[PDB]
């Protein structure tokens, strides 16, 4: 009879996933006293080395490190890696999505998007085909290191949102009726 696993969410930010980092988690668990008179309280440091590019849901288990409130086997402590909301990107496995907003005019007459990168630069990507709503374009190798092959990286994905007007003049309306494909 071993206590059922005790689960703790380990919130890591995207920059931490990018570089890999260290997390010290201090537990206070209950431990039978050196003499079985008391169930005491004890501190311990559990150090998790977050590998570069690990994915949400990765399990880091420290066996038997839960309470000994019982005369039975203490539960495993299982740290579960969660992604922390980013203010620019949305993570996606080893890819990072960049949401980019454009005018309808830009979606059909072309644009430049100056795309932020993980290392705080911007990358020009000019567009010259129709940009549909929800269209993705990969910028290869500008995502997160692949946790297994961390010399190699995934990609950065540009996902488009196309901003329409409310009002269109009469002349524009007649023209767009005559000229639009399908």
């Amino acid at each position: 009879k071993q206590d059922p696993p005790v689960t703790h969410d380990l919130r890591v930010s995207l920059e931490e996933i990018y570089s890999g980092c260290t997390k010290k988690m201090k537990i206070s668990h209950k431990r039978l006293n050196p003499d079985g008179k008391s169930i005491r309280n004890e501190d311990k440091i559990l150090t998790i080395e977050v590998k570069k590019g690990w994915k949400e849901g990765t399990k880091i288990t420290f066996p038997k490190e839960g309470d000994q409130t019982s005369n039975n086997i203490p539960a495993d402590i299982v740290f579960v890696l969660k992604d922390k909301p980013h203010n620019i990107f949305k993570r996606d496995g080893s890819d990072v999505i960049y949401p980019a907003r454009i005018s309808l005019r830009e979606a059909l007459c072309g644009c430049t998007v100056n795309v932020p990168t993980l290392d705080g630069r911007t990358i020009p990507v000019v567009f010259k085909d129709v940009i549909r709503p929800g269209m993705r374009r990969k910028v290869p190798g500008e995502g997160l290191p692949l946790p297994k092959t961390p010399e190699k990286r995934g990609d950065l994905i540009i996902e488009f949102e196309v901003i329409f007007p409310e009002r269109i003049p009469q002349t524009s309306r007649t023209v767009l009726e005559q000229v639009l494909p399908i």
């Binding site: 997390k23 537990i27 839960g66």
Partner: peptide
């Protein structure tokens, strides 16, 4: 359940 907390 045991108490857990990040530290430097």
């Amino acid at each position: 359940g045991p108490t857990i907390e990040e530290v430097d």
